[PDB]
């Protein structure tokens, strides 16, 4: 399951919430065709990989975290272990996303 997210302090939280567990973040957007298409696939993967923490951030809602994280486009996905990014890619590609998820757990 995927925690919607609305503040940088709410963001800090999850970075704690997950222990040693890798955490994937969809920086998404409402009006974006490709991010809308990938949302569902992002949701099911959260059902599968419950050893992993999924989160969403709306780039328009959190202009601030989007920037703290140099996000340029949507969907962009970023991966952390311990708190520090280890993965990240852009584009609505399910396969790449599972592939990266696995390939980083």
């Amino acid at each position: 399951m995927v925690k919607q997210i609305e503040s940088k302090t709410a963001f800090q939280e999850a970075l704690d919430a997950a222990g040693d567990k890798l955490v994937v973040v969809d920086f998404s957007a409402t009006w974006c065709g490709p991010a809308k298409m990938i949302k569902p696939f992002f949701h099911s993967l959260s059902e599968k990989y419950s050893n992993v923490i999924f989160l969403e951030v709306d780039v328009d809602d959190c202009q601030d975290v989007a920037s703290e994280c140099e996000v340029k486009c949507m969907p962009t996905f970023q991966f952390f272990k311990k708190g520090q990014k280890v993965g990240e890619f852009s584009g609505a590609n399910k396969e790449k996303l599972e592939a990266t998820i696995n390939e980083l757990v």
Partner: protein, 277 residues
């Protein structure tokens, strides 16, 4: 001089784009008069003006500049022979000009602008200052502008690939030196890497060689990050400067927001501006 007047064939007419204004200048004198010439100027000038916060901001744009020297029918000799006018008869000079099709620039004849037409005729007489007679004739904006465009950009594996650009700015009217601030969303579900761009362009309509010409100048411009297939990106306050520029009737201005697409035609928004000083 007893009487010097500009009179239109339909004195009650208000005129339209591409249409023809005609009539005559009529002269009567008390005592005999050597006359050196009768000449006409016809103009159209819209003038758009406003106060930003509380500042003097204004653009002027012409739509007619027409001048001719007129000739009595019974006086075929030429402009290097003066005419003798006399009490009694009533000397009649025909003129005819025909407006340009396209705008006459009433557009913001509103709270913000106004539009001046008229005809001056001139009487030139030896050792005199030319006398003149002037006769008129007839023919939001601080609201936000926003626009959108989509273009199918297909692929064997993405036969429904699209590219779009949706744009917004604060108003149509800007002072030299300002920043135009841009809000824009771009989608790209096509297989190409695409690049979004913007430019302010200047279209000078100018008088040259019997014409009738417009030259396009590119002023400030920016370029966004390339956008890979299956993504979107955004401008949020990304800003373009309005620079001063250095026989032209007017300059029409536009903000162009376009996404350039390799192998295909641009997807172009053209957003009209008004730009004053």
């Amino acid at each position: 001089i007893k009487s010097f007047e500009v009179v239109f064939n339909d004195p009650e007419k208000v005129y339209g784009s591409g249409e023809k204004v005609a009539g005559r200048v009529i002269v009567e004198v008390c005592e005999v008069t050597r006359v050196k010439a009768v000449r006409i100027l016809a103009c159209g000038v819209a003038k758009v003006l406003w106060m930003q916060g509380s500042q003097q901001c204004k653009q002027t744009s012409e739509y007619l500049r027409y001048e001719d020297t007129l000739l009595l029918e019974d006086q075929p000799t030429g402009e290097n022979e003066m005419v003798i006018m006399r009490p009694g008869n009533k000397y009649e000079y025909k003129f005819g000009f025909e407006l340009p099709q396209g705008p006459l620039g009433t557009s913001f004849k509103g709270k913000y602008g106004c539009v001046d037409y008229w005809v001056k005729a001139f009487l030139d007489r030896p050792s005199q200052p030319t006398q003149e007679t002037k006769k008129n004739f007839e023919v939001d904006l601080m609201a936000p502008v926003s626009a959108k465009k989509e273009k199918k950009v297909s692929s064997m594996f993405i036969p429904d690939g699209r590219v779009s650009v949706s744009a917004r700015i604060d108003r149509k009217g800007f002072c030299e030196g300002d920043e135009i601030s841009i809000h824009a969303d771009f989608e790209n579900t096509s297989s190409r890497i695409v690049v979004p761009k913007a430019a302010i362009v200047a279209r000078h309509t100018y008088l040259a060689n019997g014409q009738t010409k417009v030259l396009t100048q590119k002023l400030s411009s920016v370029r966004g990050n390339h956008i890979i297939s299956g993504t979107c990106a955004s401008w949020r306050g990304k800003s373009l400067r309005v620079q001063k520029i250095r026989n032209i009737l007017r300059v029409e201005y536009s903000l162009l927001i376009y996404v350039s697409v390799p192998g295909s035609k641009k997807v172009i928004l053209d957003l009209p501006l008004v730009i004053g000083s």
